[PDB]
Amino acid sequence: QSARMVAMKAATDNAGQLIKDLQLIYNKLRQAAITQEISEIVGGAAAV
Amino acid sequence: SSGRIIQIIGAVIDVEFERTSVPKIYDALQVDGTETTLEVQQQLGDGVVRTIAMGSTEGLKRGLTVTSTNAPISVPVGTATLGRIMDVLGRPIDEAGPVATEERLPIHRQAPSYAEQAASTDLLETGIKVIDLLCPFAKGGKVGLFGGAGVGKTVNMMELINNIAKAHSGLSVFAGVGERTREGNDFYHEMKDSNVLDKVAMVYGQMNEPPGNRLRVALTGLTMAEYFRDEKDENGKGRDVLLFVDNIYRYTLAGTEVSALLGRMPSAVGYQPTLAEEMGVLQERITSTKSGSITSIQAVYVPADDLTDPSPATTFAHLDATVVLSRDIASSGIYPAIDPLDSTSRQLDPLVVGQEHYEIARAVQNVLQRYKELKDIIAILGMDELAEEDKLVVYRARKIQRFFSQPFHVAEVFTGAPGKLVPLKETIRGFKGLLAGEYDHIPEQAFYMVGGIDEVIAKAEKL
Amino acid sequence: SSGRIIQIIGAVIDVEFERTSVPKIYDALQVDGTETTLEVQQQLGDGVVRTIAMGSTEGLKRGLTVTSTNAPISVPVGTATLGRIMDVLGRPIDEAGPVATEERLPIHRQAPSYAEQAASTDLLETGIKVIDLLCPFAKGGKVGLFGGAGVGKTVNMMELINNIAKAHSGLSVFAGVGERTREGNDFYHEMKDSNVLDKVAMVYGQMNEPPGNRLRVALTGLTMAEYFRDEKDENGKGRDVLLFVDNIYRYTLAGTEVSALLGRMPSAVGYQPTLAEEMGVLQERITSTKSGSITSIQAVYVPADDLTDPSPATTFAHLDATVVLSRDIASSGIYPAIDPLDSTSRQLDPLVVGQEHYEIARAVQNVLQRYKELKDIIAILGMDELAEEDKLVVYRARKIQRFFSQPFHVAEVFTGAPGKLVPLKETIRGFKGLLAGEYDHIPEQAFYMVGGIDEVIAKAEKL
Amino acid sequence: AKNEGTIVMVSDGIVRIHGLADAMYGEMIEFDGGLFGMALNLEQDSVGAVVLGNYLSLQEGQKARCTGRVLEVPVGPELLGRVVDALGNPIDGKGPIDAKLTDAVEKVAPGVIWRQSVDQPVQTGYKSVDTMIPVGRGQRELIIGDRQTGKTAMAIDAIIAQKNSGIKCVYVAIGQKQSTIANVVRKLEETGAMAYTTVVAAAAADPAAMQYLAPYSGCTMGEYFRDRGEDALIIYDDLSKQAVAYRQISLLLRRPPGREAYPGDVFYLHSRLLERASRVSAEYVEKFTNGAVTGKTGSLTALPIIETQAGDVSAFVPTNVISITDGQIFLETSLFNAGIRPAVNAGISVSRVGGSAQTKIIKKLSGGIRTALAQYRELAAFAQFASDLDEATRKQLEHGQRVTELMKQKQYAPYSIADQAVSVYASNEGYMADVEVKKIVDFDAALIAYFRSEYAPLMKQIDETGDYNKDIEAAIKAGIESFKATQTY
Amino acid sequence: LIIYDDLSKQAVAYRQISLLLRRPPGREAYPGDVFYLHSRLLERASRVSAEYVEKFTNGAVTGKTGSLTALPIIETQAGDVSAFVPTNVISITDGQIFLETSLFNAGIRPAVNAGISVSRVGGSAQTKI
Amino acid sequence: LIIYDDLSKQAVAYRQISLLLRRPPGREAYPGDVFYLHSRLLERASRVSAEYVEKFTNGAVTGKTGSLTALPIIETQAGDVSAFVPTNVISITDGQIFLETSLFNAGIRPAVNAGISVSRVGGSAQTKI
Ligand SMILES: Nc1ncnc2c1ncn2[C@@H]1O[C@H](COP(=O)(O)OP(=O)(O)OP(=O)(O)O)[C@@H](O)[C@H]1O
Ligand SMILES: Nc1ncnc2c1ncn2[C@@H]1O[C@H](COP(=O)(O)OP(=O)(O)O)[C@@H](O)[C@H]1O
């Protein structure tokens, strides 16, 4: 029972760290996508 | 000498002038007959000036006349503005009558030079224990307020106004950038109730105004605070003034909207190309001068919880301290609800504030961190199976948590308990004594909402 | 007739000519009274040609004069360029005197036809543990090095030069197309004091030059290499030239920098619309026809450490052997940081390298790929929540990752350990033994920068 | 009329001029009121220009004229101990600067045949730098990190450490608050480092055209000693702000964008500047000075600073520059908050010059201690999932912990070469294996104190000349063995 | 009391009109002033004082106060509340009522997500009991 | 039987030609009339009845039917089938064969991903056995 205690606590901490890293990656991707779409729209509008 | 409107597209208005007399950038213009006024933003060829209206463009045709003031927007500044509500143009909106002040100042100005900076960094004393100990301010600094609704933001602002006015004989200016009308009315009535209104001047920028109104509303408060600071009595000595901005995020958003209106290539994530310069224009005028000083309290909203977004990234390059208002502390019956571990300050270093102050502050933070890391252990297994040093840490942490709270002046009319203005020395002495272990026998209840330290002793003796 | 500059912007200059004397495309022009020369890129009617200056724009003004040479840029070729350093226009920069040769070739020419293409040939032995196993070379082929900034392209290229260009009899050409000038002064002196300068040629255009120079430097080295390839001595003797081109990405970068000024609509991620055509035009001349052979090594820059960028993605189809470097591996102390996966060669064929080589390489790649898929369970759960086979796979993959690193002769200055060279059969034997089941007791700390496998066994008793 | 023009448009600090039929690219232009501008593009009919000053006083229909000279700044030995702006005008109120020469702001670096390999070390006072990431005269090293991590402290310490070396210094402040600049100047004047230093300031409220041009003027001021057989050292406090200003100017000029809305020629913008920091040979100096000075080689060391977001070194501008300089020093937020103040991250920070820019004793002793730390970082990250391991893992982890605790230093505390050599030898030989992980800083502080109170001739001999043989290493071993016993930390 | 069935479709129509009128685009091709469009509409739902009613009615009505309540409706795609228009409108109102697709299928028919739904007015707008 | 080795390169060349002719771009700078470009080509692969052959040959050959099978190839970037050209072409064809880089490295030499691949004709295109 004590060992299961320790294992679950470690699992919680690892999951939290992974969540933080994935959140950073997601934010970077979202900003890049917004910039790319805005650039495409501006170019298309300048074409006509 | 006069002009005539030639294009009307939403808020952008183009005016054609004479060959020579073409108004400079930011020179306000007035439309004859109509209430509306215009502001210059960009010069084009053939004597054409692209402007932005500060009112509303409904009911305006092509061919009306416009008169040039040949100067930026000027607002009334003086002692007659204390306790009155104004808009971006410096016109009363409280139905209380015209402002008695006759002198005016332009709202566009250059920042003080490099030779006018003060030759030292001096702390500003507020009388609040937690703020003075863990997040010290600085004359000429900028403080970011991170907190939502229902935690006591307005009470904190009113308390700071009262404290500065009582202690340092200073005044305050409040600027609302894109604020709700209901909250503005509530704030005005709350201040009138709390007998604080007569030592503060406010400018309101409503949420339903065109972006030109919500973009230039902070400069009016800046100008009023600048006049308050430079006002010299005998022997000069200036004054110490404050300045509140309801939300710095809406300032950048209004700038973005105006830039999009005028038409220019968007920058990354859709922000305007001129962002850092636009914010540094505002933030470089809040400095401590050889005559006086100006300190700023700003509430910051983080979009999408992304600290790497351009707006918070540009904002954080100027902040000197951060105050975090937590909901758990408020729910635990502690006021003011300021997080002692998530609140940071750049002035908390041994060189600026001395050695013992730094040592005591870091020791208190370390004890609080240890208590935080032991709370989950206590919850998961129990108060038992622990040695004595951890129990002493727990008790001292509880004493500190209770001691961080204190009563306020602006709550006298509700509870009846008098307000307190505890100085820094007493706080340092009390916390050093508590950390030493002298007050290890006083019941923890005596530390709750009491103020100083001799007050703690008296309250404990009474119990 | 004479020209007349009408508009100068950036590095792009357009010149207006007479009605019936317009110079052709790619012709070189000269400005009287200055050291600047121009080349034609586009025609626009009205006798107007858009040009790129092969120099710098200082003291240049609208209204100068230009004389047309009515010929493309020509460079000196022959055996008298060996041991000399030249710039884009073919002028010596080593303070050694003029090159005594009248032979000159145009810098622009068509690619060889389909009927003069040659097949592959024998395998090139390099001495690198990871190249000789998962990415074999071939005489007359093309090699590319893909990696981010600060990962080790230059060190690997120098080691390849040191290992395979010494046991070789023939000429060699080195071209610098936008890299550091400091590295260009170390190569020259190393070759000079190693007594190998007598059979090398050098062309240098670096990152301090305007985009005109960095755009056409590679063509000069290409022309010299082509002349060396096609030349036959009496009785019909070959030469077996080698070509070393530094960063090709700077060629496309200069193209991107000038495309918008040339008057072209932008494309995805801001690149020029004609990226693939330019890349193919340059890359189709680096070939081995039926009258000669060229063995070339190139280094390719990956912008922002992503391989899906339009520039690196287009180059993948122009090479026979591709080597991919990753920053992850580099940040772990493993050198060379070559990705075992994502690195392929056309010569990995059971009919080319044999039956054992192919099987060993496939088994190694399979083990590594199987290990890669377990990165999530070990991240969330512990190591113990796996089958024994997965644990064996993980341990073997870690040992394999360590065993792919060896010290270099060139990189001795950085560390101080002497370099190593490993024959192919030793690598095959070591990997066969590792995969067979032995070496399950040797700690993975003994596989770090050892070279052979007997050295691993000897080192096992120390660490 | 060929030299006079008129203004037709003013917007966001960019002015389009009609006329000026004879003006060159980059030439200075004079407005009415002492305002100077520079040309940017010469179209068929008009001329574009940016304003170097306050453009709020310019109106359509005014006048301008061409000076006939490209951008220039005052250069000489009279600028030492002064504070000027991006154009060379003093702002400290101490009076005018009596210049004697002027130099071009934009120029090209010398050629390949005019250079020399770097072999003279530059001392900074940090153990983590002088032993793992060496710096030599003529080499350019990057200081990369996050916000609020201590980047400016390292540059100021490096400037202070040159008191006895005899090399000049230049400090450039771009996009910074005026209070910070004043505080930095005060701190420099406190320690006497102002006697051989120049400061160029461009505040956050200054126009983008001034924050753009400041690094080039600073480099031009620093090149004066490089061309004359003398050394120098230049620091750019933030090249990110210069990139942002350049992006603003380009976007206001309708150039098409790219990655992160940055245009082309950004790499060229950051490359044509850092390529000017180099060591030139004696022949170049002899030709430049027309035989005035012979047998002397000049140099110019650069220390640019770049900040990142959330510790991401894989972004566009952070990587562009990495691909230019000869190394980088990475400072990590995670280690700074932990307690490791000079938070140097080994494995991601490298030096391209290598051991050629070190003294003999330091070069021999400090061999391959960065790769070991890089391996240890990943080993410690991975080895928390095991139960039973051989002594190799324990020894490697303990050694990594001891080394990562050894390289901790306090601000304004320079270390001599002898102290670094003694500490590195003690760490390498294994004498601190039995010492606890704690009290490591106390141990080496006490060891240095004992080795300085005694053994003075040996320490001074090592300090003056950085060579060591069997005798000196035997003396070091005997001294540390004597200190190991009969002493208290 | 007024109810707007979907402000998202009004925003789409306004974007179409602005785009066909050649107004400069921006994020998601929306024009410059799209925050103003909803801000000036939603700020008209307010409670006035008895003085305003007395002045507007010229003494016809005394001692009475008016009011106007709004209940705008907005639809999100895959729960993305970070879009331009949901973020523009969330920062204008005094509260939010969040309905969840998972709660709807789970059997909670009204499907109100207490925990992320807030009301800034609070208990000041309730009867005693 | 006809095989086009890469239609992506044809798309890139068409994009270059159209952009150099100053035609307004769209998503990923691809101008209009790309779906037409890749649909008017594949539509020509079909089977023809015996009457069509008899009419075309003017009675030279009777009782014979012709056919033409297409087999184009398209390359994706990191398995992004959500791009412009892959989506434009997937909806046209009569089936897809997917090759996965994960299975190629694993050991599956004809790395065909079952389940996600489909053939619309089905069993009618098989021998009896
Ligand atoms: N080695 C050190 N030991 C102790 N304190 C240090 C050390 N290095 C820096 N600090 C302190 O840490 C803080 C870092 O501030 P600093 O100005 O050096 O950072 P920075 O990277 O320039 O930040 P920014 O430019 O974003 O304001 C300062 O209070 C400084 O005194
Ligand atoms: N094969 C290698 N062995 C050891 N160190 C290397 C190797 N390759 C690169 N490095 C390190 O990386 C730094 C940059 O080397 P370089 O070859 O210029 O990489 P890149 O060309 O990819 O930027 C050097 O300072 C060096 O210490």
Ligand SMILES: [Mg+2]
């Ligand atoms: Mg390289």
Ligand SMILES: [Mg+2]
């Ligand atoms: Mg700093």
